[PDB]
Ligand binder design. Structure first.
Ligand SMILES: COc1cccc2c1C(=O)c1c(O)c3c(c(O)c1C2=O)C[C@@](O)(C(=O)CO)C[C@@H]3O[C@H]1C[C@H](N)[C@H](O)[C@H](C)O1
Lengths: 338, 33
């Protein structure tokens, strides 16, 4: 569905801008798809304002697609994506961890399994250490060990936690040769620079675009298996200016403006970065409000307005090296009683 | 003769070529470990 693709990209750029506001000079890494999917999963249980605030925050137009069609779109996307080859590995999972005695509507658990692939695991949250182990183990298994501590603190009164994870591992079509990796300057700013391992490729034809009006250069590196990485390289001191132009429209212009061009040398750092976030402030700014207050209506979960969101956390890791790229992320939505 | 040198902050967007899903988005302002 082209609608789902568009909403997910609009959400990605909106999230990105707010993540940067937190700390505008820090590395950023996140999975917008993981967050979109987790919140769409939550909305399966939401009604009324709580529901329309979630779906609108995710950048869907309810006037052009119904709730039923949004969930069917996620189901379809989840089925299309889950992929495994000696070429490329891609896994996404959803789960709910629920207080054992909490009575859930059959329609919710049926829907959650059918549409989002979600099991329901009985969890004793009053044994906080055991409950965190169960959730963190699920995410570690799903991300093949790359994310192990998504949950640090967990209220012992928690009623449920909805979890999404994504795992990605892929080889470059044109891999770098480790013999051509050498320590080189990386300019944190015009005046501050450090030495990093810098990979290099010589004489390569790849898609290329120089955006003079935005002062940036764009290249695409393919993975084997129909994923790719789009790299955007602002001119020095122009990263803030490029960030101010990002949008679905600009990304489209980037892709469409790419042309194959022979490149004499490409230099790219070998690097590994991780970030973790609490997303409450951002979701609130993005208009997802009632879910956090005693007005919350998550009565599609239980048959009463007796649940509200307490904490939304996200963790993501990105490893880029000569042969390819690994990246993982997870999102958890922690829910208390009301 | 064109050179592309990622020796300053850059963006990286990992996408599914068929569904146009953005799996991951990243700004690298300091890659050093
Ligand atoms: C609103 O646009 C988008 C928003 C979010 C993600 C995306 C896009 C998008 O437009 C897009 C693409 O257009 C293309 C791709 C893509 O992943 C996205 C998005 O992810 C993948 C693609 O480059 C490949 O198959 C490379 O292997 C094909 C294609 O590029 C187009 C334009 C190129 N110049 C060239 O013509 C290529 C063959 O088709």
């Amino acid at each position: 569905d082209r609608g789902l693709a568009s909403a997910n990209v609009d959400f990605a750029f909106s999230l990105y801008k707010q993540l940067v506001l937190k700390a505008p000079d820090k590395n950023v890494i996140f999975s917008p798809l993981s967050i979109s999917t987790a919140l769409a999963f939550l909305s399966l249980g939401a009604h009324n304002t709580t529901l329309t605030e979630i779906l609108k925050g995710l950048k869907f137009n309810l006037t052009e697609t119904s709730e039923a069609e949004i969930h069917q779109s996620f189901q379809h996307l989840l089925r299309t994506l889950n992929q495994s080859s000696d070429e490329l590995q891609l896994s996404m999972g959803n789960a709910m961890f629920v207080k054992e005695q909490l009575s859930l509507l059959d329609r919710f658990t049926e829907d959650a399994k059918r549409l989002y692939g979600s099991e329901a695991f009985a969890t004793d949250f009053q044994d906080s250490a055991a409950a965190k182990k169960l959730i963190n183990d699920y995410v570690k298994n799903g991300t093949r060990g790359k994310i192990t501590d998504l949950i640090k603190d967990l209220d012992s009164q928690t009623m449920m936690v909805l979890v999404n994870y994504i795992f990605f591992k892929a080889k470059f079509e044109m891999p770098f040769d480790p013999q051509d990796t050498h320590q080189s300057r990386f300019y944190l700013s015009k005046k501050k620079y450090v030495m990093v391992p810098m990979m290099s490729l010589h004489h390569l034809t790849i898609p290329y675009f120089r955006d003079e009006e935005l002062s940036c250069t764009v290249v695409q590196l393919n993975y084997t298996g129909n994923a790719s990485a789009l790299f955007i390289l602002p001119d020095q001191d122009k990263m803030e200016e490029v960030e101010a132009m990002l949008s679905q429209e600009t990304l489209s212009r980037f892709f469409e403006s790419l042309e194959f061009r022979e490149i004499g040398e490409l230099y790219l750092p070998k690097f590994s970065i991780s970030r973790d976030y609490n997303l409450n402030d951002i979701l609130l700014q993005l208009g997802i409000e009632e879910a956090f207050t005693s007005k919350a209506d998550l009565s599609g979960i239980t048959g009463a307005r007796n649940l509200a969101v307490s904490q939304v956390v996200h963790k993501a890791v990105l490893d880029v090296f000569e042969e390819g790229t690994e990246a993982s992320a997870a999102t958890a939505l922690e829910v208390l009683f009301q | 003769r064109t050179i592309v040198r990622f020796n300053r902050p850059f963006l990286m967007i990992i996408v599914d070529n068929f569904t146009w899903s953005i799996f991951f988005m990243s700004k690298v302002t300091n890659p050093k470990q």
